[PDB]
């Protein structure tokens, strides 16, 4: 038939599905070790080949409660965290 590898040409949907899933799983498995940081990157890559992040996010939120996902969301923005860590010096009270 033919060979098999990651990101062959992308014209084929089946190859993209195979790799996309290989990454979805590989990530969960690395996190099963504890490499959350790699899960964020690998998941970001899964989105890079899917192009429909939001669909996948709904699919990830319903298949299992994802704590890593929350860290993916914290890895993305940097400036935002700085505002919070100043505006109200991280956290403040109310009366």
């Amino acid at each position: 038939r033919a060979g098999l590898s990651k990101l062959p040409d992308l014209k084929d949907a089946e190859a993209v599905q195979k790799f996309f899933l290989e990454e979805i799983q590989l990530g969960e498995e690395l996190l099963a070790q504890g490499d959350y940081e790699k899960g964020v990157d690998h998941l970001t890559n899964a989105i890079a080949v899917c192009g429909q992040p939001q669909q996948l996010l709904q699919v990830l939120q319903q298949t299992l409660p994802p704590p890593v996902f929350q860290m993916l969301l914290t890895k993305l923005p940097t400036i935002s965290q700085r505002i919070v860590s100043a505006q109200s010096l991280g956290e403040d009270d109310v009366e």
Binding site: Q17, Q25, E29
Partner: peptide
């Protein structure tokens, strides 16, 4: 288990 391919059976 370390196999997120549960939902992915849908496609």
């Amino acid at each position: 288990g370390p196999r997120l391919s549960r939902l992915l059976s849908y496609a």
